[PDB]
């Protein structure tokens, strides 16, 4: 219909592409009289706004108005809201302060914007917090209005969440701070994620006070709304490099596609309203000196597949959200995009931003790799009902390749429980550090293939990680390459067979030749294992007999022992004890209790010269010397008979 698009910009968007923004648009023309008028104004005073509105409304009864702005003056949107209330004309905002988010519109005004609200932005930010399991947080609110609705929305969202959020009490500011009574509430902050809701002027003072407090640490996150994030050019020096912000400022979609979608929505509403009633276009004659409108009609609208439907308050249903961070180059780094319902993440691995400034010494970020072991590291899927690991599990990632022709893969994130997970959680409780837990992709524990290691040994020795919380056997060259901690559990080796006992130990007469006994029996180990190295250092002839007796999997060897495809097996003691304590039937019987066996322990391998080694050696003796290790053994072992 009669639609005028006026644009106030300094960014040189010319007029002729707007005249070319009418031809292929509305290919199936249901309104017969469609006329668009493109205008460009450089001055942004409300005098010219009222003047051009009174010129275009008298200009052959223009019914549609579309406006964008380049500056950051939010009063222009309020002026256009008053103009739409007086003139009864649906006006759309596109860019800048004419499209900023305000508190409460009126039913007397037919002005509409795009994008999300502060409640939908809070929902997106809590979705960010949910996807990263940052459940321990706080909330700091200033005297900027609309704050009690913000606090109540956070409370109702926590009350309507599958998380069970750990929310600290709301730190409410009163005036410009004396730094006497507000500092008492700031020293109560012991959480990690700090939620701040303020304006741009007070944010500098709040971040400077938090930097003076030392509350701008590596674990002390900062997530800010869109309105405090002002000019992209004007960036004060008090921002932490890694400042999380969420705003609808999208550079991939320019103003022309947005005004084309707005024209599509307006013509769709006009064409669907023309079938309901005929005399829909009725405007005011002149400024000097309606029953059926589109104010209550275009709640349902969808153009070109993109669901751009509206709400009953003046917002959209499915907007496009932008998640930006601050790099080390003091620039707003655009990272995250939002889907129609869920959230997309460009960086699935969250970056640390360990140094927000140059004078920030940090020593607590530790990279940990581990291996899947059934009594120790249980790796399972994420819960599809919550998209959240249960509290007693930790997140993990693994670089799993897609196909075998290329080497590209995906870091699939899963959940982890078990025994070493409990050890790592108690170390995080006591030592109070940060961990970076993930899975190994090369293979097993480690094997020197011609002065080349692999697996967790290749991750620790080449210093891509720090330590391994998971279980590891200890021999000579492993103690040569790294430094082990103190052991905590008495786990030697053992032999599983089918009370009578045939094998007495390593001094068995069966360990000489199976031709000596009338049934030719069989026993092997797991491939690529350190037990193989222990046998090859003990007896090479035993390795020569075991070469024809190899197998593949621990559960495969278990099925081979149950059915009868294997006679005996050599493994460690306590893992076989745990597998036999939960087995139905209990036909497989262990041999001894570690008498003619290796009788080694399980330690934590650290790098040569790590400062954490003494603290871990104190913490393990603290965990064993109070029965808490016995509590974990009661939790993760079942001693039957």
């Amino acid at each position: 219909l009669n639609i005028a698009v006026l644009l106030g910009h300094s960014h040189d968007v010319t007029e002729r592409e707007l005249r070319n923004l009418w031809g292929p648009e509305q290919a199936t023309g249901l309104p017969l009289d469609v006329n668009v008028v493109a205008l460009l104004m450089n001055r942004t005073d409300p005098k010219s706004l009222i003047t051009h509105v009174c010129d275009l409304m008298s200009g052959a009864r223009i019914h549609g108005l579309v406006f964008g702005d380049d500056t950051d003056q939010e009063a222009v949107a309020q002026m256009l809201d008053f103009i739409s209330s007086q003139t009864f004309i649906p006006i759309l905002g596109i860019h800048g302060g004419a499209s900023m988010i305000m508190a409460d519109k009126d039913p007397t005004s037919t002005f509409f914007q795009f994008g999300a609200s502060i409640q939908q932005q809070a929902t997106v930010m809590l979705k960010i917090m949910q996807d990263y399991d940052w459940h321990v947080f706080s909330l700091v609110t200033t005297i900027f209005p609309g704050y009690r609705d913000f606090i109540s929305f956070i409370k109702t969202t926590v009350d309507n969440s599958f998380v069970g959020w750990d929310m600290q009490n709301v730190i409410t500011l009163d005036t410009s701070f004396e730094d006497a009574k507000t500092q008492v509430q700031l020293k109560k902050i012991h959480s990690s994620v700090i939620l701040l809701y303020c304006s741009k002027d007070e944010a500098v003072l709040i971040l400077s006070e938090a930097r003076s407090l030392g509350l701008t640490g590596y674990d002390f996150f900062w997530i800010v709304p869109s309105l405090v994030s002002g000019n992209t050019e004007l960036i004060p020096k008090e921002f932490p490099s890694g400042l999380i912000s969420v705003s609808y400022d999208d550079w991939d979609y320019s103003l022309e596609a947005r005004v084309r979608d707005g024209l599509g929505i307006l013509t769709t509403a006009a064409s669907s309203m023309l079938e309901k009633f005929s005399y829909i276009p009725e405007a005011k004659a002149s400024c000097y000196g309606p029953l059926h409108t589109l104010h209550q009609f275009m709640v349902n609208v969808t153009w070109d597949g993109k669901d751009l439907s509206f709400t009953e308050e003046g917002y959209q249903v499915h907007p496009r959200l932008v998640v930006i961070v601050l790099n080390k180059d003091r620039e707003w780094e655009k990272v995250g995009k939002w889907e129609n319902q869920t959230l997309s993440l460009r960086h699935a691995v969250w970056p640390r931003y360990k140094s927000f400034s140059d004078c920030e010494p940090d020593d607590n970020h530790l990279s940990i790799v581990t291996l899947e072991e059934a009594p120790f590291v249980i790796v399972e899927d994420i819960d599809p009902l919550t998209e959240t690991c249960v509290r007693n599990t930790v997140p993990c990632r693994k670089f799993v390749k897609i196909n075998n022709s290329t080497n590209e893969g995906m870091n699939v994130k899963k959940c982890c429980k078990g025994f070493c997970i409990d050890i790592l959680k108690k170390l995080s409780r006591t030592v109070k550090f940060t961990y970076d837990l993930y899975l190994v992709t090369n293979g097993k524990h480690g094997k020197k293939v011609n002065n080349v290691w692999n697996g967790m040994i290749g991750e620790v020795v080449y210093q891509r990680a720090v330590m391994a919380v998971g279980s590891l056997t200890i021999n000579e060259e492993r103690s040569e390459v790294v430094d082990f901690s103190v052991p905590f559990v008495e786990t030697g080796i053992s032999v599983m067979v089918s009370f009578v006992d045939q094998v007495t130990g390593l001094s068995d007469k069966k360990f000489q030749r199976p031709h000596d006994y009338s049934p030719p029996f069989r026993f092997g180990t797991v491939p690529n294992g350190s037990t193989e190295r222990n046998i090859r250092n003990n007896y090479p002839y035993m390795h020569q007999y075991m070469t024809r007796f190899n197998q593949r999997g621990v559960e495969d060897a278990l099925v081979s022992l149950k059915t009868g495809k294997l006679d005996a097996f050599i493994y460690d003691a306590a893992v076989l004890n745990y597998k036999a304590g939960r087995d139905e039937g209990c036909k497989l019987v262990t041999i001894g209790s570690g008498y003619i066996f290796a009788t080694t322990g399980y330690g934590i391998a650290l790098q040569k010269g790590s400062p954490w080694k003494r603290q871990i050696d104190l913490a393990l003796l603290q965990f064993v010397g109070d029965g808490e290790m016995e509590e974990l053994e009661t939790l993760w072992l079942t001693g039957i008979c």
Binding site: V486, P487, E490, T599, G601, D617, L618, L621
Partner: peptide
Amino acid sequence: RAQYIEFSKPFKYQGLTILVKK
């Protein structure tokens, strides 16, 4: 004692028990 001196690797591995007479 780990806070005051340094420790080596343990050579013995055992637990505790109760001496009674029968």
